[PDB]
Design a protein around this ligand. Structure first.
Ligand code: CDL
Ligand code: CDL
Ligand code: CDL
Ligand code: CDL
Ligand code: CDL
Ligand code: PC1
Ligand code: PC1
Lengths: 85, 80, 135, 168, 53, 62, 383, 105, 231, 103
């Protein structure tokens, strides 16, 4: 135990936390702001690169019909194997 | 010779025995630092960096610093 | 047109800070630019004195950091947990008492896996406080 | 019109509030998936056709000539038929950047156009829905903002065993 | 003050020619040296004979 | 690569080069910190913490 | 060349006239290309028309074969004149750069405008049509020559280093040819001496086996846009087309001796399109004729006899050798009287440096003798 | 290892010589060549087109080692439970008396 | 979660800036074989076979600045994590593999089908091909696992031995003044011998492990290289 | 003569190095970075308590609770959230007042 503790980074300075929802929403707002202007047509490769893959992935998530339960990604406690909630 | 893993470099001879035997050694031209030069102890007459500062003095200086490092809190303890 | 892609577009004069730079280069070159200073993949030099100087310095500053920043956390945790479970409780002690506690922590560190196990295992019949003392 | 910028927020909200996904919305998404696969298939077919048409004569002769891997007889007949059909008339056979453009730009345009108009179709479908997702879509297009916790505000339907929270 | 060597070395490294040994070119150029007077006489005689022929 | 440099023949020559002067100072620190620990941590008046059984790292990591 | 505000003003002023001129040139060049393409398809060899496949022996990757996928139309003079071919070549260069810019515009929508500002500020990648006066054209040609100077040495060094590191010539004549091929432009290379290098390199790397990095260097040296490079068979196709047109024009000129009747400016342009005559060299007609005749001699009798040019890699190296200027040397020789390590003088010599000076100085023989005698005495005493 | 030279048209053995799982699929059994994987493998080896066997394998491994492995690990559907929580199809519908906003017009 | 931390190379970066503002020759390289792939003259490769030299040199420098200096007490190997090493090896190995695969030459994989035509294709050759394709990925995994495990085991052993030496030196040196001094002197001499032996072993093992780390990557590259003969 | 390493500035050389010298390696690295920040950028509170603290989690002050309290107070104050709304409490305001009077 004590010997194992010697293999840690020794210059940790600061830790910041952010919810996935929050920064995903902020990123989407940035993307909408930069892809909104008229001088970037929807058929341009840049616009499709920005939008199509995200749309496809979100559609795949929505279509999902799984017989098992996937525990919430951001639970308070994910260390207990016998408690998915 | 060696000091731990540090080995003293040695110059390879370049003269043959015949040519070498004809060389006349005149130590009067040599610098005072290197007279009676010995490959096994070339720095015996080398000057000290600081006059009067012995190697033992520096070793003892380090020992005293270690003692201070370990004993200062015994005399001037501080609260958490 | 705004910024040049070539390193030849100078931003300062050739003589800017010439003196300090030359002193810095003199410091760098005196011991390193030598025939016997042949490095192994730029990391291990051939000059002995570079080892003799840099190994102690690296150890010294690493040890200072470890003693004053890293192990201090464990020491403070032991002091807090063994003497009230709160920082104010520890501060209620005197500096001498804290010194004693910290030096006992050092003892435990030096024993580690080879010292006596009565330093943390309470023998049966011992009269000293147990784990439920502050609970 | 750029429907993706409006729809990304809606899709993220639906994922976050997927509990209220009716079977109709699920069918809508499955149809979107099917149409995406269909668009991929037709675009790939167009790309293959353009590649084959612009292929060099020697390339076609090597590809659709002897030997035959199976040598059943139908294989040789089909290969000879295709080779004759391609080599009968004159074909513009560019190389390099030109073949890249000819083979790719039509494919990209077709795929992008189909996908964009299917996205518009999905937006209309969700607009016509009589579920909480449809109401959220209409509110999004009206106010321009996604109203989270809408299902619990307007008290969207819940299973009979979970209506206690609405009991106020 | 030896620009040709500088330019060649820099260019070779910039085009992924890291190696600093050229055994084949050395093999081509290693035995090159200015000739002796007698060798010059022989070569001049050969050239004169060739021109006469 | 350990190719060359000043190499003192014996202890007394460590003072013939500044780098080896620093080295011998550091060696003094290294070797002299052990006697200090012997004196400090084997002292007669050193007392174990009375509350050493209240908490230990062993129960924490377990 | 670096961007400048004056060039930006020049290109912004002449933007729309330049576009109109480019469109007119596009119509004319399409007509010329249509004539050439019809003639190629009708009278070309079966391999050339059918685009026969030539694969590499190691990874079986297709690339253009100089013998089969290139064809010199000896009877093109009937349908297309020399000037029309030159016009088509110039338009091909301009069209390539314009096409890349248009592709960037279409790809990035309106976000390419600032990059367009960077583009118009430099004459490196603008079409020749943007210059409406002689001075503007001269500056544009200077920019092209600067890019050629920047790019050619890397190509030459790549070729030479790879061959010299992995192979050697077979015989003395090949050795001389290889050595003289890569001489700087300040000396005149004899094409007869240098020609055997073509066959020697044909043994090593034909045009069908040219590597992608070497191709990138070559296209940089030819003022061909390289971004996006993509597969090597795109810019390779561009190179093949350009040099096929050049060889057709060369056959026309050699057969009809047009260069003798060609005027000074047209002759200079003809050499420049072959990468033989930089404009900054201020060459006269004698020098231009000498270089053109050397180029024709390098092509060799077999070019006229059968339309077969030497190896294209070696040909490109030979012609681009005219942009391999001597390495610059500026500064009076008196500068060699200074010292470089005066800043270390204050440090003096430590014990080890003093020992090294003592042992390897003028007294080195005496020290060696004394040391060896002492060691011998000690060894004798030990025994 | 060494350079690979494609066989000439005359060096390729006839299809009838190839063997399947049990035996050659000669006349009256030619159409079974499409279904017999071992016959196709032997034919590919005979024609020196061994890549048809090797390329699909390696790529598949890469596809699993790179992209599908993590997808299955993080987003795959585990085995269903014994007592299954099916959907009653009651959630989502708007409540009675609710006035939905008008659609765009 | 975003953790802000720093590597343990800042002093070494300072030394690099100080000592390499001027040029110096390099004549000793841990993995020299990346520079000499071809040993028979007149052989040449159209593939960019010297592309690995720069990455090899930088990787050697980085791993040496970390691993070799980690022998100094309290020096931290900041990157010592299993999955981080997996990421590094994944980058290098998969990048080169994708370089060979993007070549779109399927014949390059002909050698994967092990054996000759005599061997049964389905029951022998195809199973060997399966095993070899598996072995490529296993080579990647083994490379990163071997680099991680060596460092971890060596440093664990060093820490434990140092702890034992501190214990006996501090709490049993008084025996020098006692009648059992000979036992303590024997133990102390044994500990010094063990100390020197461990340090030498670690110094050798670090360099050797870097050599093998680069050798695995170069072996991946060499397995797919084809050399033409000059004529 | 022109060389990328000697003539170009550092950002330009960086782009050239990772676009015309090691483009595949850069692509794979970016791929791996995206994967790491998509699947290995989360830590639960229990995980932080078990492993997130150098000497162990200081339960005697519970910094995680204080951090969350600051977070939620900031969100409530900035977003003007009515935490007494029935959806948060599950009961009407009048029932809440009745409960307050009871307890
Ligand atoms: C050149 C490169 C070389 C170097 C390689 C280097 C790398 C190593 C190689 C290995 C790869 C390493 C991995 C690196 C990471 C790369 C990314 C990655 O892995 O992403 C996977 C990732 C996996 O998805 P996911 O994110 O995990 O989500 C899973 C969901 O399934 C996602 O759902 P979705 O909604 O996105 O839809 C996906 C859909 C994708 O598919 C579709 O959308 C539909 C189909 C598309 C077809 C595309 C065109 C094909 C050609 C058309 C026809 C041409 C000829 C025309 C003329 C004909 C004349 C007669 O797939 C499916 O869902 C499966 C549907 C299957 C239906 C089967 C129905 C049964 C009947 C048909 C099969 C059985 C027939 C039996 C016949 C028997 C006869 C006897 O993405 C995908 O695979 C899907 C999106 C991309 C699709 C691209 C489609 C084109 C593919 C290329 C085809 C052509 C080239 C191949 C042949 C070459 C021959 C020379
Ligand atoms: C923001 C936009 C995002 C875009 C995303 C899309 C990707 C990027 C787009 C394009 C980017 C620009 C650059 C592309 C590469 C340029 C390459 C190049 O320089 O080529 C020069 C070359 C010109 O040189 P050339 O001398 O004229 O001819 C080449 C020589 O023959 C050369 O002679 P050779 O001796 O080298 O001969 C060999 C040559 C022979 O090939 C050729 O050169 C012929 C042309 C290619 C034919 C490919 C089709 C083969 C047959 C497919 C059959 C599929 C059946 C499936 C049926 C399914 C039924 C259920 O190559 C091959 O043999 C390679 C064959 C391909 C193997 C593919 C293996 C894939 C393995 C898949 C692994 C698993 C994947 C994941 C799992 C999926 C499933 C779950 O160009 C071409 O030949 C054609 C270039 C086409 C460029 C791509 C066009 C892109 C269109 C995009 C439409 C979709 C957009 C979607 C947007 C989404 C929203 C944003
Ligand atoms: C609106 C949707 C947009 C979609 C998104 C697009 C995104 C941008 C990508 C680039 C798009 C093209 C940009 C315009 C290029 C200019 C036109 C052109 O081809 O110039 C000829 C020229 C041909 O080059 P080459 O090397 O000589 O070609 C060798 C051939 O052997 C040459 O053959 P040859 O030796 O036998 O000689 C023939 C020559 C003989 O002609 C002449 O000598 C006369 C001159 C003719 C060409 C004139 C070009 C002028 C360019 C400048 C235009 C003015 C710009 C003004 C700018 C300022 C405006 C204010 O005539 C040609 O050049 C014909 C070439 C073949 C035609 C290519 C066009 C195919 C696409 C268009 C049809 C699409 C239909 C859609 C249907 C939809 C169905 C569903 O093109 C280029 O320089 C290549 C483009 C360079 C940039 C490449 C960038 C990467 C491309 C990747 C594309 C992958 C697929 C798409 C998906 C991408 C996703 C990532
Ligand atoms: C109205 C006009 C007419 C209509 C339009 C017509 C069409 C126009 C478009 C087409 C034009 C084409 C021709 C363009 C030529 C010029 C190109 C160029 O740039 O030349 C260099 C150009 C100068 O050229 P030059 O002086 O003429 O020299 C040319 C020589 O021949 C030297 O030449 P060289 O060859 O040596 O230079 C080449 C160099 C070109 O590059 C450069 O020179 C770099 C330029 C940037 C340097 C920046 C240095 C300064 C950094 C400052 C940082 C910040 C400082 C602090 C600021 C504090 C502010 C408060 O390197 C490259 O070529 C590298 C290319 C790299 C390509 C990257 C591709 C990535 C692909 C990704 C992977 C995908 C894989 C597939 C995945 C598929 C998955 C499915 O550079 C500049 O002028 C530098 C400008 C710097 C601007 C300020 C710094 C950035 C400001 C950013 C503001 C952001 C605001 C928003 C922030 C929002 C935050 C939320
Ligand atoms: C809220 C609290 C504040 C924090 C906010 C943070 C916001 C975060 C947003 C969300 C981000 C999410 C993702 C995070 C992922 C993190 C991953 C990570 O850390 O990986 C480990 C990894 C460790 O890398 P490494 O191996 O240690 O090497 C990186 C080192 O920087 C060393 O590498 P290198 O040496 O190769 O670097 C090149 C180096 C080459 O060497 C040098 O240039 C030497 C200098 C090195 C400086 C950098 C090292 C920093 C050392 C520690 C701090 C120094 C003291 C600071 C004092 C603070 C006092 C409070 O050059 C530079 O560093 C260029 C900058 C030079 C600045 C010089 C300034 C001179 C000013 C002079 C003024 C004079 C005024 C006179 C007025 C007179 C009036 C009369 O970190 C990174 O790779 C970088 C991560 C950065 C991610 C982006 C973060 C966003 C930007 C935040 C900027 C905040 C600015 C405001 C702060 C204000 C004070 C409170
Ligand atoms: C190419 C091969 C290189 C081999 C080099 C061999 C070096 C030989 C060193 C001999 C002993 C040195 C003793 C130093 C003592 C320092 C002071 C001290 O107290 O330290 C005690 C420390 C630790 O001793 P400790 O563990 O007894 O400490 C006790 C402290 N308590 C009780 C609190 C725990 O000693 C060391 O850690 C020294 C180990 C050295 C191992 C060799 C490292 C080589 C790699 C780094 C090379 C750096 C070169 C940089 C050059 C510039 C580069 C650009
Ligand atoms: C305590 C527990 C310990 C567990 C330890 C487990 C091991 C962890 C090891 C971590 C370190 C090593 C990581 C090595 C790298 C692994 C890579 C990996 O598997 O990542 C896969 C993952 C898969 O991504 P994904 O997980 O988002 O997959 C989406 C699939 N659905 C939507 C169905 C859920 O890749 C990424 O995360 C990067 C994705 C973005 C970059 C690629 C985009 C292009 C995709 C092309 C195909 C599809 C689009 C169509 C074509 C393009 C059109 C423009």
């Amino acid at each position: 135990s004590n010997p194992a503790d010697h293999f840690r980074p020794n210059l940790k300075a600061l830790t910041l936390y952010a919810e996935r929802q929050h920064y995903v929403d902020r990123w989407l707002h940035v993307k909408e702001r930069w892809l909104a202007p008229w001088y970037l047509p929807w058929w341009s490769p840049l616009f499709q690169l920005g939008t199509w893959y995200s749309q496809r992935s979100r559609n795949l998530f929505l279509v999902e019909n799984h017989l098992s339960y996937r525990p919430y990604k951001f639970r308070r406690n994910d260390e207990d194997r016998n408690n998915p909630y | 010779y060696n000091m731990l893993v540090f080995r003293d470099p040695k110059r390879r001879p370049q003269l043959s025995e015949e040519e070498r035997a004809k060389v006349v050694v005149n130590q009067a031209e040599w610098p005072e630092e290197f007279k009676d030069f010995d490959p096994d102890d070339p720095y015996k007459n080398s000057p000290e960096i600081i006059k009067g500062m012995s190697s033992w003095n520096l070793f003892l200086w380090g020992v005293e610093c270690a003692f201070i490092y370990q004993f200062y809190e015994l005399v001037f303890p501080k609260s958490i | 047109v705004l910024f040049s892609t070539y390193r030849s577009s100078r931003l300062v004069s050739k003589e800017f800070l010439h003196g300090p730079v030359m002193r810095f280069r003199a410091l760098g070159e005196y011991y390193f630019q030598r025939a016997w200073n042949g490095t192994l993949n730029w990391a291990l030099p051939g000059e002995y004195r570079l080892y003799a100087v840099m190994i102690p310095f690296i150890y010294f500053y690493h040890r200072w950091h470890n003693d004053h920043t890293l192990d201090r956390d464990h020491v403070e945790k032991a002091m807090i947990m063994r003497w009230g479970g709160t920082l104010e409780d520890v501060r209620k002690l005197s500096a001498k008492d804290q010194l004693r506690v910290r030096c006992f922590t050092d003892i435990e560190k030096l024993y580690s896996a080879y010292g006596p196990k009565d330093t943390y295992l309470q023998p049966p019949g011992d009269t000293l406080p147990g784990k439920d003392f502050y609970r | 019109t750029k429907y993706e910028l409006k729809m990304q927020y809606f899709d993220e909200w639906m994922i976050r509030w997927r509990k209220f996904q009716t079977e109709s919305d699920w069918e809508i998404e499955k149809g979107r998936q099917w149409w995406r696969r269909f668009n991929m298939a037709v675009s790939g077919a167009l790309f293959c056709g353009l590649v084959l048409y612009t292929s060099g004569t020697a390339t076609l002769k090597r590809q659709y000539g002897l030997p035959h891997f199976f040598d059943i007889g139908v294989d040789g007949q089909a290969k000879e038929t295709m080779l004759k059909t391609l080599t009968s008339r004159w074909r513009y056979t560019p190389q390099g950047y030109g073949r890249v453009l000819i083979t790719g730009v039509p494919t990209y345009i077709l795929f992008v156009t189909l996908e964009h108009y299917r996205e518009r179709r999905r937006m209309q479908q969700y607009l016509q829905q009589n579920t909480v997702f449809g109401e959220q879509m209409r509110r999004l297009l009206s106010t321009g903002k996604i109203e989270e916790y809408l299902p619990v505000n307007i008290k969207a339907t819940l299973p009979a065993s979970q209506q206690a929270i609405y009991n106020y | 003050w030896c620009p040709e060597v500088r330019d060649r070395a820099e260019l070779e490294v910039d085009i992924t020619g890291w190696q600093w040994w050229s055994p084949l070119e050395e093999r081509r150029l290693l035995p090159v040296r200015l000739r002796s007077v007698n060798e010059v006489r022989e070569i001049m005689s050969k050239t004169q004979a060739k021109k006469s022929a | 690569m350990l190719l060359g440099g000043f190499v003192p023949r014996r202890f007394s020559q460590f003072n013939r080069d500044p780098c080896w002067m620093f080295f011998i100072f550091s060696v003094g620190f290294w070797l002299g910190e052990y006697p200090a620990m012997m004196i400090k941590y084997n002292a007669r008046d050193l007392v174990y913490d009375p509350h050493r059984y209240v908490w230990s790292h062993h129960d924490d990591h377990h | 060349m670096q961007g400048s505000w004056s060039v930006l003003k020049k290109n912004c002023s002449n933007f729309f006239p330049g576009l109109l001129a480019f469109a007119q040139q596009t119509q004319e060049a399409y007509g010329i290309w249509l004539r050439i393409y019809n003639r190629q398809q009708k009278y070309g060899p079966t391999d050339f028309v059918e685009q026969s496949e030539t694969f590499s022996p190691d990874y079986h990757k297709r690339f253009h074969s100089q013998d089969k996928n290139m064809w010199v139309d000896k009877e093109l003079c009937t349908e297309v004149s020399q000037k029309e071919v030159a016009r088509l070549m110039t338009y091909k260069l301009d069209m390539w750069r314009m096409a890349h810019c248009a592709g960037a515009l279409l790809a990035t929508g309106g976000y390419a405008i600032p990059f367009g500002l960077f583009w118009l500020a430099n004459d490196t990648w603008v079409p020749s049509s943007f210059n409406l006066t002689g001075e503007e054209l001269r500056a544009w040609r200077e920019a092209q020559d600067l890019y050629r100077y920047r790019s050619a040495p890397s190509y030459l060094t790549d070729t030479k280093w790879h061959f010299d590191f992995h192979a050697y010539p077979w015989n003395e004549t090949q050795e001389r040819a290889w050595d003289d091929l890569f001489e700087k432009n300040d000396v005149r290379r004899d094409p007869k001496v240098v020609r055997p290098a073509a066959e020697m390199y044909d043994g090593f790397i034909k045009f069908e086996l040219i590597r992608r990095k070497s191709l990138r260097h070559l296209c940089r040296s030819m003022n061909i846009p390289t971004f996006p490079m993509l597969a090597r068979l795109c810019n390779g196709t561009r190179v093949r087309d350009y040099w096929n047109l050049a060889w057709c024009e060369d056959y026309m000129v050699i057969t009809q001796r047009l260069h003798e009747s060609m005027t000074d400016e047209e002759l200079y342009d003809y050499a420049w399109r072959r990468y033989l005559a930089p404009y900054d060299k201020n060459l006269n007609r004698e020098q231009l004729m000498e270089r053109v005749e050397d180029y024709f001699e390098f092509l060799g009798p077999d070019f006229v006899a059968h339309g077969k040019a030497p190896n294209l890699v070696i040909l490109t190296n030979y012609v681009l050798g005219y942009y391999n200027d001597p390495a610059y040397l500026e500064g009076d020789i008196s500068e060699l009287d200074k010292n470089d390590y005066d800043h270390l003088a204050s440090w003096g010599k430590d014990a080890f440096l003093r020992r090294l000076e003592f042992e390897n100085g003028p007294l080195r023989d005496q020290v060696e003798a004394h040391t060896q005698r002492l060691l011998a005495e000690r060894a004798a005493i030990a025994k | 290892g060494e350079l690979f030279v494609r066989p000439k048209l005359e060096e390729i053995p006839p299809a009838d010589q190839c063997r399947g799982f049990f035996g050659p699929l000669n006349d009256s059994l030619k159409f079974l060549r499409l279904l017999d994987i071992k016959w196709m493998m032997n034919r590919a080896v005979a024609m020196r087109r061994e890549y048809l066997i090797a390329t699909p394998t390696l790529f598949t491994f890469i596809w699993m080692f790179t992209w599908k492995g993590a997808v299955i690990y993080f987003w795959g559907d585990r085995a269903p439970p014994r007592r299954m929580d099916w959907n009653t199809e009651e959630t989502g519908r708007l409540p009675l008396g609710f006035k939905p906003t008008p659609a765009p017009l | 979660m975003f953790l802000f931390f720093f590597c343990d190379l800042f002093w070494l970066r300072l030394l690099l800036c100080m000592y390499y503002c001027v040029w110096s020759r390099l004549c000793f390289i841990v993995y020299f074989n990346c520079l000499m792939l071809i040993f028979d003259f007149l052989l040449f490769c159209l593939f960019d076979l010297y592309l690995f030299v720069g990455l090899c040199l930088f990787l050697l420098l980085w791993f040496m600045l970390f691993n070799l200096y980690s022998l100094i007490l309290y020096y931290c190997i900041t990157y010592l994590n299993l999955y981080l090493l997996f990421c590094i090896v994944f980058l290098l190995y998969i990048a080169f593999l994708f370089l060979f695969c993007f070549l779109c030459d399927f014949f390059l994989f002909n050698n994967l089908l092990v054996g000759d035509s005599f061997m049964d294709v389905f029951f022998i050759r195809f199973l060997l091909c399966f095993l070899e394709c598996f072995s490529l990925l296993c080579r990647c995994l083994s490379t990163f696992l071997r680099l991680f495990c060596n460092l971890l085991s060596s440093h664990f052993l060093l820490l434990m031995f140092f702890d034992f030496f501190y214990f006996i030196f501090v709490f049993f040196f008084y025996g020098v003044f006692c009648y059992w001094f000979i036992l303590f002197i024997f133990v102390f001499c044994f500990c010094l011998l063990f100390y020197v032996f461990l340090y030498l072993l670690d110094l050798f093992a670090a360099i050797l492990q870097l050599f093998i780390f680069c050798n695995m990557i170069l072996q991946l590259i060499m397995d797919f290289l084809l050399f033409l003969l000059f004529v | 003569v022109y060389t990328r390493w000697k003539c170009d500035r550092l950002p330009v050389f960086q782009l050239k190095l990772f676009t015309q010298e090691y483009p595949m390696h850069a692509a794979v690295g970016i791929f791996t970075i995206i994967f790491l920040w998509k699947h290995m950028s989360h830590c639960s509170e229990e995980t932080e308590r078990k492993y997130g603290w150098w000497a162990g989690y200081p339960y005697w002050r519970d910094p995680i609770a204080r951090r969350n309290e600051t977070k939620y107070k900031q969100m409530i104050i900035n977003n003007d959230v009515d935490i007494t709304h029935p959806k948060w409490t599950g009961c009407s305001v009048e029932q809440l007042e009745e409960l307050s009077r009871v307890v």
